[PDB]
Design a binder for this molecule. Structure first.
Ligand SMILES: *[C@@H]1O[C@H](CO)[C@@H](O[C@@H]2O[C@H](CO)[C@@H](O)[C@H](O)[C@H]2NC(C)=O)[C@H](O)[C@H]1NC(C)=O
Ligand SMILES: *[C@@H]1O[C@H](CO)[C@@H](O[C@@H]2O[C@H](CO)[C@@H](O)[C@H](O)[C@H]2NC(C)=O)[C@H](O)[C@H]1NC(C)=O
Ligand SMILES: *[C@@H]1O[C@H](CO)[C@@H](O[C@@H]2O[C@H](CO)[C@@H](O)[C@H](O)[C@H]2NC(C)=O)[C@H](O)[C@H]1NC(C)=O
Ligand SMILES: *[C@@H]1O[C@H](CO)[C@@H](O[C@@H]2O[C@H](CO)[C@@H](O)[C@H](O)[C@H]2NC(C)=O)[C@H](O)[C@H]1NC(C)=O
Ligand SMILES: *[C@@H]1O[C@H](CO)[C@@H](O[C@@H]2O[C@H](CO)[C@@H](O)[C@H](O)[C@H]2NC(C)=O)[C@H](O)[C@H]1NC(C)=O
Ligand SMILES: *[C@@H]1O[C@H](CO)[C@@H](O[C@@H]2O[C@H](CO)[C@@H](O)[C@H](O)[C@H]2NC(C)=O)[C@H](O)[C@H]1NC(C)=O
Ligand SMILES: *[C@@H]1O[C@H](CO)[C@@H](O[C@@H]2O[C@H](CO)[C@@H](O)[C@H](O)[C@H]2NC(C)=O)[C@H](O)[C@H]1NC(C)=O
Ligand SMILES: *[C@@H]1O[C@H](CO)[C@@H](O[C@@H]2O[C@H](CO)[C@@H](O)[C@H](O)[C@H]2NC(C)=O)[C@H](O)[C@H]1NC(C)=O
Ligand SMILES: *[C@@H]1O[C@H](CO)[C@@H](O)[C@H](O)[C@H]1NC(C)=O
Ligand SMILES: *[C@@H]1O[C@H](CO)[C@@H](O)[C@H](O)[C@H]1NC(C)=O
Ligand SMILES: *[C@@H]1O[C@H](CO)[C@@H](O)[C@H](O)[C@H]1NC(C)=O
Ligand SMILES: *[C@@H]1O[C@H](CO)[C@@H](O)[C@H](O)[C@H]1NC(C)=O
Ligand SMILES: *[C@@H]1O[C@H](CO)[C@@H](O)[C@H](O)[C@H]1NC(C)=O
Lengths: 415, 121, 187
């Protein structure tokens, strides 16, 4: 079966890269403003030093994940003012020159679909949220440079110095990477453009509709909010003491009888803090693994043409475009898919004069009466000649060889 | 988490950032690669008299490829480059023992420690 | 080190030395103090065990990545981009460091570049010629065919291009002539 038509398909893939950075303080959480509580808490050697060290390690790793993912270009490229890409329309992903935040339309749709006083109550107990190193105005610049590098220089900018090339010619360089000849593109170029734009038109209409695609990027926020809410709720627990608030205990009890109650409260809150620290340490590993996978996809899918199957989408990979979502990355993969196929009768070789001819690169087919040679991934019949096949042995050992004739395109010219 | 007030003692060159209040650093308009990450797109460094400066870190040199619809660029010379990459493979192997750690050479401690069934196992 | 420091802590007991407690206290009131010490040290040990268990996973992931790099970068030529260095990968060398490995990657990088005017195809006699493997370029007056990653001009012939269709559907096709390196020999 040989295909006869093709289809360009653009798909989306979401990936979390980093989470929120938080820090907690024992002196404010376990004891608050009290002093007798701190004096008793000093009896535990260095439980809080390691608890505050682990969170600092997680926070410093979160700012390295994003740096690994996005920061892969040493030069901030810029698309030329004249938009002449041979019919392809990139205005839906190129940065908007009007809105103050230079983010493309699809980035705005991605940002509006994620929903990042509850906050004050958390902050009042020594819990703080540190700001990330890279603001969105810089991540957007990085993705804009990455996207403007691929559409004007190909894969060359990822391995040295960017070298310009017309887009309609690299779109053929990329067809040669999957097994289709150049002349397929140049003779169907308009059609392919009229396909690609349409695919882009179906992306935003899928993100602006009532669909749950960024949910994998929202579960990360939900888990982090839930853990903090539970940690704050743990302060309203007796843990065996007479009262759950420390000021009351200090107010209506002498030190000798207050020390045991304070110790019970301290051990309860210490366990409640250690559990949260362990959970965050476990979750950071999953976030790190996802960030590494996203960095690999950026390196290979975007800055080159991948040949690994089902890695950069479904189909034959052509190119990819990156976009930034709140605390994550979105990849738009462009793929080539055969559409319409037809049956044919095949044969391994052809015996002409006691010699067996094999296809140089292609396959023999037949429409019922004559035999042609065609490329594997597209239908394009051709006449069998000697400048197109190669000979090896005689037609005795091949299983399904058949009679036929070979052109040998040199006899008529000599006459 | 201070607006700049809430500061006990201040001085000269007080600079306001999105990450908080900065005292002891002089603000400039230049932009270099990050040296000490202050946060929220602000970095700090020590330079030339000698002082500590805080700036908005830059991303890299900006250029525009001379893109045209019938223009290509072809290389003519090459270069062989050798780079290094470090990777950890393993760490140290350590072992600990409760009876020597928690109790030491004592005997009455082991009898009490036996009340916890299979913790040290 | 931190683990050892946890032996120098009261944890609520009268003293942090077990021999001191056992030396000056009879069993009935010594038991509670010893129990406090035991539970404190048990927690101090569990924390260390959990931290080591978490760190071992990161070490294992790094070891797996190093094994993959040794299998692919070293024992073959990789085509994955930015995996075995920056540039086009050629070969690699392994070296050993205390508790780790060091890879020396050799890569090929283009250095100097020049501008040219390109064209998708060539129309000779109502037929469109496409490059078999390469690209058409021009130095201003004549047209040549050259490989993509290096500059090596060549004369356009028929044993170097292939024909498909007529020059009506290609966007930027141009007039030119093709050698057909067989006419002069027959004469
Ligand atoms: C290959 O498929 C394309 C589209 O899938 C076909 O182009 C369509 O042709 C019909 C009628 O000829 C038009 O009504 C459509 O608008 C075309 N599609 C587009 C996107 O323009 C094309 O004809 C097919 N080729 C073959 C040989 O069947
Ligand atoms: C590329 O896509 C943009 C976005 O759809 C097109 O701009 C639209 O043009 C139509 C006119 O046919 C207007 O009604 C829309 O309001 C425009 N949209 C936007 C967002 O500006 C554009 O025409 C397409 N083609 C080119 C060559 O740019
Ligand atoms: C198989 O393909 C061959 C070659 O295209 C077809 O033969 C041609 O058929 C047309 C239609 O009548 C004639 O005008 C040509 O003169 C034929 N060429 C030759 C060399 O005979 C053939 O008809 C096709 N068979 C089927 C079943 O489609
Ligand atoms: C291809 O054709 C040749 C002759 O042109 C076939 O060779 C003869 O085949 C017949 C029928 O099988 C035998 O009786 C003869 O003994 C063969 N040899 C001769 C005539 O010298 C050959 O078999 C054909 N290939 C096939 C059928 O696969
Ligand atoms: C930091 O504190 C100053 C002083 O209170 C704030 O400045 C005031 O802002 C309000 C808001 O409208 C104005 O009505 C006052 O006139 C301002 N006073 C002065 C002296 O500037 C400032 O807004 C605070 N910083 C932030 C980020 O809110
Ligand atoms: C390609 O580059 C190499 C080195 O980058 C050039 O070789 C140098 O040539 C100059 C003078 O011709 C010598 O002084 C250097 O010592 C050479 N370098 C080395 C490493 O030997 C070479 O000339 C360049 N080729 C072209 C065509 O420009
Ligand atoms: C473009 O290349 C052609 C071919 O190398 C150059 O033509 C040659 O120029 C030299 C220099 O005078 C002459 O000796 C040859 O006889 C020319 N060959 C032919 C076939 O005419 C041409 O000069 C180059 N153009 C530029 C601008 O460099
Ligand atoms: C390549 O050359 C042919 C003739 O050798 C051009 O065909 C003629 O072009 C002129 C000017 O465009 C027209 O007025 C004629 O009607 C064309 N046909 C003839 C003379 O039979 C062809 O256009 C050239 N290719 C280009 C310019 O891309
Ligand atoms: C090829 O032949 C099979 C067998 O009858 C048939 O089921 C199939 O539909 C044919 N292919 C196409 C594209 O119709
Ligand atoms: C295919 O199978 C048929 C039996 O249905 C047999 O006659 C024929 O020789 C086989 N041909 C090949 C090439 O296997
Ligand atoms: C930085 O530039 C602005 C405007 O260009 C200017 O007002 C300001 O004074 C400059 N900074 C310093 C420290 O002079
Ligand atoms: C190619 O032309 C552009 C446009 O003027 C120019 O900026 C560039 O420097 C040229 N290439 C080289 C290698 O000089
Ligand atoms: C390139 O653009 C120019 C306009 O600047 C136009 O005249 C020419 O036909 C275009 N050629 C191709 C091959 O796109």
């Amino acid at each position: 079966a040989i295909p006869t038509n093709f289809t360009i398909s653009v798909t989306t893939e979401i990936l979390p890269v980093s989470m929120t950075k938080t820090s907690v303080d024992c002196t404010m959480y376990i004891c608050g403003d009290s002093t007798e509580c701190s004096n008793l808490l000093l009896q535990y050697g260095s439980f809080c030093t390691q608890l505050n060290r682990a969170l600092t390690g997680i926070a410093v790793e979160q700012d390295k994940n994003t740096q690994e993912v996005f920061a892969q270009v040493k030069q901030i490229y810029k698309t030329p003012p004249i938009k002449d890409f041979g019919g392809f329309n990139f205005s839906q992903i190129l940065p908007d020159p009007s809105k103050p935040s230079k983010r493309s339309f699809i980035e705005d749709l991605l940002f509006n679909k994620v929903t990042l006083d509850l906050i004050c109550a958390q902050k009042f107990n020594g819990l703080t949220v540190l700001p990330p190193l890279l603001t969105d105005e810089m991540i957007a610049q990085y993705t804009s440079a990455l996207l403007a590098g691929t559409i004007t220089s190909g894969w060359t900018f990822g391995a040295g110095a960017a070298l310009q090339i017309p887009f309609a010619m690299q779109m053929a360089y990329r067809f040669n990477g999957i097994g289709v000849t150049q002349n397929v593109l140049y003779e169907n170029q308009k059609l392919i453009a009229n396909q690609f734009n349409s695919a882009i038109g179906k992306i935003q209409d899928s993100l602006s509709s009532t669909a749950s695609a960024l949910g994998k990027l929202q579960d990360v926020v939900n888990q982090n909010a839930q853990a903090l809410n539970t940690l704050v709720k743990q302060l309203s627990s007796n843990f065996g003491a007479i009262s759950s608030v420390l000021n009351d205990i200090l107010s209506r009890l002498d030190p000798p009888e207050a020390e045991v109650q304070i110790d019970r409260l301290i051990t309860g809150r210490l366990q409640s803090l250690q559990t949260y620290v362990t959970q965050q340490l476990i979750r950071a590993a999953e976030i790190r693994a996802s960030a590494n996978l996203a960095a690999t996809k950026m390196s290979e899918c975007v800055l080159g043409q991948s040949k690994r199957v089902d890695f950069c989408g479904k189909g034959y990979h052509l190119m990819s475009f990156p976009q930034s979502a709140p605390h994550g990355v979105v990849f738009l993969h462009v793929t080539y898919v055969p559409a319409q196929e037809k049956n044919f009768t095949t044969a391994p070789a052809i015996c002409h004069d006691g010699k067996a001819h094999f296809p140089r690169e292609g396959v023999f087919v037949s429409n019922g009466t004559h035999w042609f040679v065609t490329q594997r991934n597209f239908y394009e019949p051709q006449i069998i000649t000697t400048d197109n096949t190669f000979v090896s042995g005689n037609c005795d050992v091949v299983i399904g060889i058949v009679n036929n004739t070979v052109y040998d395109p040199l006899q008529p010219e000599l006459d | 988490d201070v607006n700049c007030w809430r500061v006990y003692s201040t001085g000269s060159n007080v600079f306001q950032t999105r990450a908080g209040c900065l005292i002891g650093a002089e603000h400039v308009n230049n932009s270099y690669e990050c040296d000490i990450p202050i946060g929220a797109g602000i970095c700090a460094s020590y330079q030339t008299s000698q002082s500590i400066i805080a700036y908005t870190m830059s991303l890299g040199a900006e250029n525009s490829v001379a893109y045209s619809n019938n223009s290509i660029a072809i290389p003519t010379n090459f270069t062989i480059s050798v780079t290094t990459e470090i990777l950890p493979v393993s760490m140290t192997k350590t072992s600990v023992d409760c009876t020597m750690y928690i109790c030491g050479d004592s005997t009455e401690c082991s009898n009490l420690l036996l009340q916890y069934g299979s913790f040290c196992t």
